[PDB]
Each structure stands twice: as structure tokens, then as C-alpha cells.
Amino acid sequence: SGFRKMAFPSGKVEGCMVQVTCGTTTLNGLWLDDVVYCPRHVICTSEDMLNPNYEDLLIRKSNHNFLVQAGNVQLRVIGHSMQNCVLKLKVDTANPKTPKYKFVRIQPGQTFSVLACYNGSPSGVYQCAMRPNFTIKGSFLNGSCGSVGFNIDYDCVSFCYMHHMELPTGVHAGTDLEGNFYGPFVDRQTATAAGTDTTITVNVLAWLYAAVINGDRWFLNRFTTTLNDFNLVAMKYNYEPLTQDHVDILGPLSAQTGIAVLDMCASLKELLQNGMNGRTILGSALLEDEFTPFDVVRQCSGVT
Amino acid sequence: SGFRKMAFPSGKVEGCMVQVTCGTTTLNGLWLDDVVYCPRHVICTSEDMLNPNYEDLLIRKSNHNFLVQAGNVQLRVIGHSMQNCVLKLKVDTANPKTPKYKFVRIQPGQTFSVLACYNGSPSGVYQCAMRPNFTIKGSFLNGSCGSVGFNIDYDCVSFCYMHHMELPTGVHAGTDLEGNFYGPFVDRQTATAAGTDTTITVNVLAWLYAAVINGDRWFLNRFTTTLNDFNLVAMKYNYEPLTQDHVDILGPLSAQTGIAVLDMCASLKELLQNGMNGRTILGSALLEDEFTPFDVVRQCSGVT
């Protein structure tokens, strides 16, 4: 028993993190096969980050202006292309610790582990959710850029995120591994604010099921509700509307625990209307929305 | 900026996790050099566990009754000793991915990352604090035993925990890597209860400093207090008494932020007496005590 915000093992990813340096600016890169991927703002100086012209900046760069380094060993760059907001540096050595991988684009509400690095070296690993407003709330500082987010299905590493910037609200923005940003953000320092951050709801439900599986039942009630009467309430508290697809997704957990999804929705309705009244759920005093149904089922049934 | 409960990279440890099977019972083991360490209750059946005599149980066991396996590859056991609550199985192959390591015994309030495994295979990694009452609150299920807790100092892996059991209160107990339990617990299924757990006050303070460093100041006040007047209040809310040694430890964070420890103590006093009144701190609605001062300084200054 017990339930914790657990992240995927980071070993396979550690083997791929290298350091990329262009002039003065240094950041992390991902080394898969004989290709190194990294945030393109590597080529910027601090001076022109206000609104850099990356096409013009790249024209004046050559292979040798990029210093890629796998720990102690130097990597020779033998080609470089800009793909959206990422650089693809071809190196002359294939990473032999390159795992089976895929590049994926996740949806808001889905989760992944981030391996935060500095100078191509691991710092630590934590779990994130891609927020409805297409930001994430992690821990990054300078040098963090090029740190990747990912999931693991047995042998295969699904890379879904590469870190690029932090918004003035204290939240973070990045791209997929094809260099396409999540949300309306761009790799330049303008006053781009984030949109309203809403609560994922289905995830809160999954987490309430996790709570039941691990011995918390105080929040359960004899009440039930309709999707419509639930959603009328949920919207008031800045929650994503719950759809029939969401209900379908919550099926396995509902069946496992023998608590109907609409009964659990009723409990969440009571929780939102009246608060927790001093009590806690799995050691939290507010409703957690960064656990997917698959996350809960994974942890609770000990998947490797 | 931003502050998450980050967990150390698990790669070096992953390389050491093997599967150990004795008869029907299977659990995880740690393979360092040519030695495999694992919880001794591996030799028990289901019945045995009520109150096993391990000396008597070990009489009928031989090298060949232990099936050690590093993923797909089989390990030949060529010797086995019982050292406290752990078995030391000597195998005929030295783990070539054996990192620089130490075995350490942690103190209550100190933290470490746990790599939860099943059938010698990684599941995930999360951070823990050794509680004042010598338990931890993690995620373990059957087959998790032999999962290890650890810290990393550059090249060196400091193994400090190996998982053994879950108490009826839903909390977890284990040993160090010499097989000596943390707290008064034993590897048998009797009603041996844990002591009342208190809150690690110094850690809560460190975490409030983390909050300040990452842009939360709403909880700061024009009040200050004495250690004595603080502790009178802290005792009421089941908090560890704060000592001058604790104050000394909080020096660097106090100096960095320019907020006296006793001013921060006053803020914690207000927080405890009046609650957070709808606001949050680093995305939590109750006071976190599983971050050490060293944890905060590490994360905030991007140590690898």
C-alpha cells in the first residue's frame, strides 16, 4: 500500500544526456543514434534574446561553432539543421546506449517524468502533468534547457518534452522532440502570459480512486450525480468538463474499487462545495490532478 | 525557479538490481561486486512469516535453493551468509556496472531516493524522509522487498535503506545494507506498533526558505519569536522541538534570503495557529517536512 508521486527510472535517458555549447551559451542536448537534439536558442547571445532571428543567426554558424560533449569525451559535429525550435546536430559517433525510443506529442492532462540536467549531467527526476493551458510546473534554472520529459513502456522510451523557457508567472514552457511548442509560446523573451490554468478533473477522480485503494474512504458518500449536474458545479470551480470518454477511462478503477464513477463524481462535488474540513487524502490538503488513471493502475499493480 | 520533490537519478542503482527467488517466494536483491544482498525473509513461505526462526529455516537451505538472476542472465550462487536481517549471497560473477558506493546509516529527518522494483526490474523512483518514529511513507507492494533507498555524492552511491515490510498503519519499515532495522521493528508479522510520529520542524523551515527563494512571501510577517516561545507552540502541534543546532543548520538559507531563522519561526507559528487560509506554498496546502536544508540548497543551486 501507500501512494506516491513516482517518476519513471531515468537510467535509459541518463545515457543520452550530453552537453552542448555554442560560444558563451551552454545547455543540455539529447543524443539518440548519431544525432544530438537541443533547444535552438543555444545560438543566441543574451543581447539579442528579446527577439532573435534564428535563420540569420544560423547562417553565421558552422559545425565547429557547436561543442558537443558526452561527459568527459568530445563529440565531433559533422552537420546541423534547424527543425522548428530545435537544432539537429549530426555527430560522427552513434550513442551505443541509445534505447528503443519514439518521439511523441502528449495531450493536456497526460503526465511524464522530467530528468532535469545541467552541463549534460543529471540533477534529478520528478513527475509532471502537461497542464490544460499547455504549461508545466517543474524545477528548472539556467542550464536546464534541453532537459527532456518522457515515459517508458517496457523497452521503449517515449520522449514527449524538451525544456525551453520559464514564463514570468513562474511556470514552464517547452516543445516536443520535433521542436514544436506546446501551447501558443515561442522561444523569445516577450511578455507572453499563460492562459487560465484549469484543473484536470479526470485525474482528480483517478487520484480519489487511488485514495480508496490505499485505505481512505472518509470522503465517500451515499450520494450520486449526473454528468450534467456535476459539470455545472465543476465549471464554477475552474475544472475541465468531464466527458463520456473520461468516464470510460475511469472504468477499470471504478470496477476494481466497486465505486461507480458518478458516485465518485458526487464525492468530488461535495469536496469542492464544502472543502476537506481539515482532513487529508493520501497526505494532501487539496485535490491532486497530476495522476492519470494509467498512473494509478501502474503504481497500484506494480508495473515495471 | 520552481521547487519540486526531485529524486536522484536512478541509473547507477538500476545496474545493481537483480531478482532473487527461493522456492515460491521472489524478491529484489542488490548486486555489488560479486555479492548479492537481499531481505532474509526470502526463505520463508506464507505460513512461516507469522513468527519465523531464520536459523532453523536456513538449515534446509543450500546455495542452489537461491536462484539469482540479472535480468535475462543467470547468476550462480557459490556461498551464502545471514548477516542480521539480510542474506549475503556470493555469486561467481562480479557486477561490472558496480558503481563507487558506500553503505551508510541515515538519521531521522534525513532524506533519500527509493527505487521501487519488482522481479529485479525498476518500476519507479521517489524521495522519502526517514520519519522521527523510524518509519517511511512510500509505495510498496508484494514483491517490492529488497528495493533500496539511497543518495548520490557525485560518483558515489550511498545506500542507506533496504525494504522489508509494511506496518498495519500503512507505513513502511526496513533496514540498512548491513541488515540492521531502523527503529524497534523486526522481520516477522506480529502486532509490533510504531511510535507516535512527529513533524520534522527544521525541514519545514528549510522548505519555507525554499518557498521564499522561489517567490512566495505572503506567509512572512513583521513578527519574530524566541526558541522557547516557538517550541511551546510547536509542541502543541506535534512538532519536533527546535534546537540551536537546527538554527545553525538553517544559517546558509537564512543568510541567502536575508530572513532570520527566528523570524521564519514566527511565520511558521502564525501558519500553525491560523492555517494557510486558502493560500498555498510551492503548490501545497499543508506544511512539508521531507526537504532537508541540504536538499533545498542542492535543488536551488542546480547540483549534479
Side-chain angles (χ1 to χ4, degrees):
Chain A
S1 72
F3 200 86
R4 305 270 298 192
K5 204 168 258 178
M6 183 174 335
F8 284 105
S10 77
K12 296 171 189 63
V13 176
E14 283 169 36
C16 309
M17 300 313 301
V18 304
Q19 181 192 235
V20 189
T21 313
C22 189
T24 197
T25 319
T26 305
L27 48 63
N28 309 283
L30 185 71
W31 181 32
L32 307 176
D33 306 297
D34 66 336
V35 180
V36 177
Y37 306 79
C38 68
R40 68 179 180 171
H41 72 253
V42 66
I43 69 192
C44 304
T45 71
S46 59
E47 196 83 53
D48 58 1
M49 288 203 198
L50 177 64
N51 196 330
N53 183 305
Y54 289 100
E55 293 69 22
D56 288 338
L57 286 144
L58 197 70
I59 287 285
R60 314 188 312 101
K61 299 299 176 189
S62 295
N63 286 356
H64 69 85
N65 285 135
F66 301 97
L67 293 99
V68 181
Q69 198 157 21
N72 215 245
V73 170
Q74 217 74 46
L75 274 179
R76 178 171 185 75
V77 162
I78 67 177
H80 70 282
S81 297
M82 193 186 293
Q83 177 178 65
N84 306 289
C85 303
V86 300
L87 295 174
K88 292 188 54 172
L89 312 173
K90 190 182 186 241
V91 292
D92 72 338
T93 325
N95 179 3
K97 296 195 170 173
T98 299
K100 283 156 179 173
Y101 73 98
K102 282 195 294 248
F103 280 171
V104 179
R105 180 164 189 96
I106 53 161
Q107 308 269 128
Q110 291 306 117
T111 61
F112 55 97
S113 301
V114 184
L115 181 64
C117 303
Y118 308 91
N119 305 105
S121 289
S123 159
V125 56
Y126 52 93
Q127 198 64 1
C128 277
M130 180 52 76
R131 298 246 41 88
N133 71 357
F134 282 102
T135 45
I136 73 173
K137 302 193 309 312
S139 190
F140 307 92
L141 311 147
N142 304 40
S144 64
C145 289
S147 302
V148 304
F150 64 101
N151 301 92
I152 302 169
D153 190 313
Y154 180 55
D155 52 357
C156 189
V157 171
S158 294
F159 298 103
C160 58
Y161 180 92
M162 180 171 271
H163 182 69
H164 279 268
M165 77 208 303
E166 181 177 317
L167 308 185
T169 60
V171 296
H172 300 104
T175 64
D176 53 25
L177 270 300
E178 287 152 48
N180 291 124
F181 260 97
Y182 289 91
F185 312 115
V186 280
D187 53 341
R188 65 194 71 263
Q189 256 136 227
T190 66
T192 318
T196 301
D197 180 15
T198 67
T199 319
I200 318 192
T201 314
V202 46
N203 282 4
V204 169
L205 293 170
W207 171 80
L208 287 172
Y209 278 113
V212 166
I213 290 165
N214 298 261
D216 293 354
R217 309 186 71 85
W218 65 265
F219 54 82
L220 298 169
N221 52 19
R222 295 288 180 188
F223 305 149
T224 186
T225 199
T226 74
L227 251 181
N228 169 233
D229 286 358
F230 171 71
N231 278 321
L232 286 170
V233 175
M235 55 177 204
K236 191 167 197 167
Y237 295 113
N238 255 332
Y239 271 52
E240 274 185 6
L242 197 80
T243 73
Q244 189 58 47
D245 218 290
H246 291 151
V247 177
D248 283 338
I249 258 68
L250 292 185
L253 291 184
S254 177
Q256 192 166 326
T257 67
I259 297 171
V261 174
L262 290 188
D263 287 22
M264 191 63 87
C265 284
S267 292
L268 177 47
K269 190 177 154 195
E270 184 155 283
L271 276 169
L272 287 176
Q273 285 173 339
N274 297 338
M276 291 197 180
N277 193 242
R279 297 210 59 175
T280 67
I281 308 184
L282 294 176
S284 197
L286 48 66
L287 301 161
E288 185 70 42
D289 78 349
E290 293 203 331
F291 292 87
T292 68
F294 178 91
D295 288 352
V296 176
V297 167
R298 169 169 46 113
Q299 183 162 193
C300 289
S301 83
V303 174
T304 74
Chain B
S1 89
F3 198 85
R4 298 288 299 215
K5 191 173 272 154
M6 194 172 327
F8 282 109
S10 76
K12 296 174 186 297
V13 177
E14 283 169 35
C16 310
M17 301 312 302
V18 304
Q19 181 192 239
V20 189
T21 313
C22 187
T24 198
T25 319
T26 304
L27 63 80
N28 309 284
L30 186 69
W31 181 31
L32 310 178
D33 306 296
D34 66 336
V35 180
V36 177
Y37 307 78
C38 68
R40 67 179 181 170
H41 73 251
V42 66
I43 69 188
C44 305
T45 70
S46 293
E47 189 204 54
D48 294 344
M49 293 189 173
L50 272 303
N51 196 336
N53 182 301
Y54 290 95
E55 291 78 33
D56 285 339
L57 284 186
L58 208 55
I59 295 178
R60 305 174 302 101
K61 301 303 180 190
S62 303
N63 287 356
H64 66 275
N65 285 133
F66 301 88
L67 297 319
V68 182
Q69 183 172 3
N72 196 68
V73 73
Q74 175 67 47
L75 272 178
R76 180 177 300 286
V77 162
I78 66 176
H80 71 283
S81 297
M82 194 195 309
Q83 173 180 110
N84 306 291
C85 302
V86 300
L87 285 182
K88 292 195 299 184
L89 313 174
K90 190 183 178 205
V91 293
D92 73 337
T93 326
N95 179 4
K97 299 199 174 187
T98 297
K100 229 185 77 170
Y101 74 98
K102 282 178 175 201
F103 282 166
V104 184
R105 182 162 186 103
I106 53 160
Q107 296 306 324
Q110 292 305 117
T111 62
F112 55 97
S113 301
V114 184
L115 181 64
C117 304
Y118 300 90
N119 307 89
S121 289
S123 162
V125 55
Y126 52 92
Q127 189 92 338
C128 277
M130 184 84 234
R131 300 302 306 163
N133 74 352
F134 283 100
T135 45
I136 71 172
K137 312 174 298 186
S139 192
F140 298 105
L141 294 172
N142 283 52
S144 75
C145 288
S147 301
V148 304
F150 64 101
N151 286 81
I152 302 172
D153 154 42
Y154 181 55
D155 53 355
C156 187
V157 175
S158 295
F159 298 103
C160 59
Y161 180 86
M162 178 172 273
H163 182 69
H164 280 267
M165 78 193 70
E166 182 207 314
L167 308 187
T169 60
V171 297
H172 301 103
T175 64
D176 53 24
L177 271 300
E178 302 180 318
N180 292 124
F181 263 78
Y182 290 90
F185 311 115
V186 205
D187 53 340
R188 67 162 88 102
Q189 313 187 151
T190 63
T192 43
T196 301
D197 195 16
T198 67
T199 316
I200 320 160
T201 308
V202 62
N203 283 5
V204 171
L205 292 170
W207 171 80
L208 287 172
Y209 278 113
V212 167
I213 290 166
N214 297 259
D216 293 354
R217 308 186 67 86
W218 66 266
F219 54 82
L220 299 168
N221 53 17
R222 301 176 85 111
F223 296 86
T224 187
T225 199
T226 74
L227 252 180
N228 284 2
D229 286 0
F230 171 69
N231 278 320
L232 286 170
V233 175
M235 167 193 65
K236 189 200 169 164
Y237 294 113
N238 207 58
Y239 270 52
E240 272 185 357
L242 196 80
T243 73
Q244 189 58 47
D245 291 2
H246 291 151
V247 178
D248 283 338
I249 192 65
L250 291 186
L253 291 185
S254 177
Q256 191 197 323
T257 67
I259 297 169
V261 174
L262 291 188
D263 288 19
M264 191 63 89
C265 283
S267 292
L268 177 46
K269 189 180 85 187
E270 185 86 16
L271 261 49
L272 289 205
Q273 285 173 339
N274 297 336
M276 287 204 204
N277 289 6
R279 300 219 52 182
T280 66
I281 307 183
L282 294 174
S284 199
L286 48 65
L287 303 160
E288 250 290 294
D289 77 349
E290 294 203 330
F291 292 99
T292 69
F294 178 91
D295 288 353
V296 176
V297 167
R298 178 172 91 236
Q299 184 164 190
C300 288
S301 83
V303 176
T304 55

